[PDB]
Design a protein around this nucleic acid. Structure first.
Ligand SMILES: [Ca+2]
Ligand SMILES: [Ca+2]
Length: 47
RNA sequence: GGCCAAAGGCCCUUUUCAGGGCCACC
């Protein structure tokens, strides 16, 4: 599990953006940047 | 434990069903 406050807060932000839409990746997980970015993309559609 | 999803490493953006950058892999 991830603990770095910069990674957590950015991940939380991508999520916030998501559950702010009209219409889910675990932020506490160990993942490369491309990996987490990939899941958020897919998840954002749709959602 | 592993079985699937995502995934080169890292970074920026509400163009966010998306756009962009560094580095590496000739
Ligand atoms: Ca795959
Ligand atoms: Ca990897």
């Amino acid at each position: 599990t991830e603990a770095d406050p910069a990674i957590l807060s950015r991940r939380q932000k991508q999520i916030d953006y998501g559950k702010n839409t009209a219409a889910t990746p675990n932020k506490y997980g160990k993942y490369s940047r491309r990996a987490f970015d990939g899941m958020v993309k897919i998840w954002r559609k749709s959602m």
